[PDB]
């Protein structure tokens, strides 16, 4: 099967080549069939009630959709295994970087042991194919170089999963594809893509499409992809759960204040709560307070003009000047004030988030990205902003400097080129300036 074994990764290559534009057409054709969906009608006549399609002098409008929907589900399949083809290394690399970080520096699983991720990360050390997808694969032995002096070796070797450790340390010093594969590491990293946020949302995008062939109208929830797709309209839906932690409890206050306020009408003001204009057919809703409370949160937070507009005019003297206190102490509380809190905790938070959306633009526009010198003192030198932004304190040239020190040998590197690396590997970073670059006290000999 060697003629096909590289042919399918060649298929996956031009599958992942135009991933962005394929996802764009996957959005727009679903948008187009959800637009052509606007011309559906239902009636009692057969083509009980049968959902038919309304068309004017065109015949292939209905057999187009039965292939366009399978087209949308197929391109949904395409983008799903394209996601799992290109960028599962992004959800792979950083957390075993984090894991090796706490193995070498802190000792998170040997010196102590702690949540949701910390004990699921214990099904990854003992397999021999753990570091196969990260650059440093001697990570299981420098932890023994680190803390082989304080604890027992025979316990930590079995805990880290070194099979015949003392034999391999002398052997490496001196001198059926799925059957050799592991059973635990693949299901361990199969758990994390379901745990993380993006892949389960992209699978939610496809769990509706095969369901969409059962009934055509559940394709409408695919138009909420506009809300999370762009970042501009992502902050509106993100602002609710940004301050939901107090908003659910103050709408609970809204739920309990009217539950306090309706028992006095259920007990003392049973007379007038009636909307049935028929005299022979009277059905008041202040007979059961479970009905009365659903009625009260159906109209009182709703109408915006009190509660006694569903109820006719108090022309009688039976507690006349008490209901005019009742209605306005409903009015001054539940529509005037406690609705304006729910307005404010959305609109203010909108203002706070959109202002900090561009104060980071202010921070890129004025600050330095390296150190703590602002741009106000670069004003004496004419156009001294870009000569410091593009070349010297640049974001790309430093990662290029981190790039070019990896490939060639360290029998080539100099005093400063080893100075920048020998504490980079043990990861201590007071090597950046953080207070002086070309301007503060280098001005005395600068012409």
């Amino acid at each position: 099967w060697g003629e096909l074994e590289v042919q399918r990764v060649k298929f996956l290559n031009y599958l992942s080549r135009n991933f962005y534009t394929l996802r764009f057409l996957a959005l727009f054709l679903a948008f187009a069939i959800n637009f052509i969906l606007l011309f559906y009608k239902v009636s009692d006549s057969p083509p009980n009630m049968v959902y038919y399609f309304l068309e004017e002098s065109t015949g292939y409008m209905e057999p187009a959709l039965w292939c366009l929907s399978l087209l949308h589900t197929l391109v949904a399949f395409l983008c799903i295994i394209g996601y799992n083809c290109l960028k599962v290394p992004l959800v792979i690399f950083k957390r075993e970087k984090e894991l090796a970080r706490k193995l070498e520096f802190d000792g998170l699983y040997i010196t102590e042991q702690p949540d949701v991720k910390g004990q699921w990360d214990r099904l990854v050390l003992n397999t021999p194919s753990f570091p196969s997808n990260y650059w440093d694969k001697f990570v299981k032995r420098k932890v023994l170089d680190k803390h082989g002096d304080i604890f027992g070796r025979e316990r930590i070797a079995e805990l880290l999963g070194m099979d015949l450790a003392s034999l391999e340390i002398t052997a490496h010093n001196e001198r059926t594809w799925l059957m050799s594969i592991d059973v635990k590491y693949q299901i361990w990293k199969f758990g994390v893509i379901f745990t993380d946020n993006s892949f389960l949302y992209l699978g939610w995008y496809m769990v509706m499409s095969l369901l969409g062939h059962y009934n055509n109208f559940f394709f409408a929830a695919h138009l909420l992809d506009i809300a999370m797709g762009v970042k501009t309209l992502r902050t509106i839906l993100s602002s609710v759960t940004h301050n939901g932690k107090q908003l659910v409890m103050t709408v609970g206050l809204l739920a309990v204040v009217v539950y306090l306020y309706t028992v006095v009408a259920f007990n003392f003001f049973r007379k007038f709560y009636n909307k049935s204009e028929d005299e022979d057919e009277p059905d008041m809703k202040c007979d059961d307070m479970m009905t009365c409370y659903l009625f009260h949160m159906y109209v009182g937070v709703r109408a915006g003009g009190g509660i006694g507009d569903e109820i006719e005019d108090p022309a009688g003297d039976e507690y006349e000047l008490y209901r005019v206190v009742f209605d306005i102490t409903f009015f001054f509380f539940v529509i005037v004030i406690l609705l304006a809190i729910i307005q404010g905790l959305i609109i203010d938070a909108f203002g706070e988030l959109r202002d900090q959306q561009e104060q980071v633009k202010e921070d890129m526009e004025t600050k330095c990205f390296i150190c703590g010198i602002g741009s106000d003192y670069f004003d004496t030198t004419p156009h001294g902003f870009e000569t410091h932004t593009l070349e010297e304190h640049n974001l790309a040239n430093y990662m290029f400097f981190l790039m070019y020190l990896i490939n060639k040998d360290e029998t080539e590197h100099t005093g400063q080129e080893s100075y920048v690396w020998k504490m980079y590997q043990e990861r201590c970073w007071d090597f950046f300036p953080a207070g002086d670059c070309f301007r503060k006290q280098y001005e005395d000999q600068l012409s």
Binding site: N13, S16, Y20, L86, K87, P89, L90, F93, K94, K97, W135, Q356, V360, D363, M364, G372, E391, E392, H393, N394, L395, A396, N397, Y398, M399, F400, F401, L402, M403, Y404, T414, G415, Q416, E417, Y419, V420, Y424, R427, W429, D430, F431, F432, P433, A434, D436, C437, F438, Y442, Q445, L446, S447
Partner: protein, 281 residues
């Protein structure tokens, strides 16, 4: 440690350096005559490779106005007469690809052979304003003659910068170490105007980078970036991951933990360029 530069400056190193540099600029005046003269001349220029890293190392711990830095440049006025040659030698073969880059100098002899005659190019190069009069026929003699009727600038082009891709960048580094290190000096300023060509050619391949060190004494270090990883960092596979982490160094990051995230950002990006260069065409 700058204690070696106490004796290496005061003793007998630099007249030996000018005695090397004279023959270094004079050997390739005659070792460009024939096609069988290049596999040993490139041996001499990856000796030039380490001749430049000889005095690259005396710029370590470089005081801005220091007598070591002035004795770096009195070199080139004790030996003023052998530097113009090695500065224009890297210009007479690097505007070489800029002759072909214009369409006016391409449509001279439209023969499908590719054998343009030498005399049709001599009077053509005499018409440009970026050339020197007596300096035409000598590089014509450096080119292959073949009875004075064959240039073949496709092999005039790609053969003479294969040893001048690595030495040209480091001599550009040599001219740009000292321009910003010692200011306000007359005679070290003219030769960068005479040799700004390799600096202009290596503008994308040059970078100016600062590291704090040696008990609060910061001085700049230069590096090289390859053309393979040059043109591919400017793609939207990573230029939006740029702003993806630009948004979250002030939104959640502190002052003490800002670049501790940035080094993992750089290694994760060079990791996706590892796998993307694997699956690249």
């Amino acid at each position: 440690c700058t204690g070696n530069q106490q004796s290496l400056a005061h003793s007998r190193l630099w007249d030996a350096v000018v005695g090397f540099l004279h023959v270094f600029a004079h050997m390739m005046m005659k070792l460009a005559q024939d096609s069988s003269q290049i596999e040993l001349l490139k041996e001499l220029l990856d000796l030039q490779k380490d001749m430049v890293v000889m005095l690259l190392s005396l710029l370590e711990g470089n005081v801005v106005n220091g007598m070591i830095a002035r004795q770096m440049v009195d070199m080139l006025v004790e030996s003023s007469s052998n530097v113009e040659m090695i500065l224009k030698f890297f210009d007479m073969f690097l505007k070489l690809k800029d002759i072909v880059g214009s369409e006016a100098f391409q449509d001279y002899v439209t023969d499908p052979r590719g054998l343009i005659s030498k005399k049709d190019f001599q009077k053509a190069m005499d018409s440009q304003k970026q050339f020197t009069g007596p300096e035409i026929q000598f590089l014509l003699s450096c080119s292959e003659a073949d009875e004075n009727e064959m240039i073949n600038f496709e092999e005039f082009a790609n053969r003479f910068q294969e040893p001048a891709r690595d030495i040209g960048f480091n001599v550009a580094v040599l001219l740009t170490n000292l321009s910003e290190h010692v200011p306000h000096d007359p005679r070290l300023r003219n030769f960068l105007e005479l040799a700004e060509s390799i600096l202009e050619y290596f503008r994308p391949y040059l970078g100016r980078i600062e590291i704090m060190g040696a008990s609060r004494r910061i001085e700049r270090i230069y590096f090289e970036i390859s053309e393979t990883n040059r043109a591919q960092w400017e793609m939207p596979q990573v230029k939006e991951s740029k702003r993806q982490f630009i948004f979250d160094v002030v939104n959640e990051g502190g002052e003490a933990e800002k670049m501790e995230l940035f080094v993992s950002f750089c290694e994760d990006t060079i990791f996706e360029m590892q796998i993307a260069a694997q699956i690249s065409e």
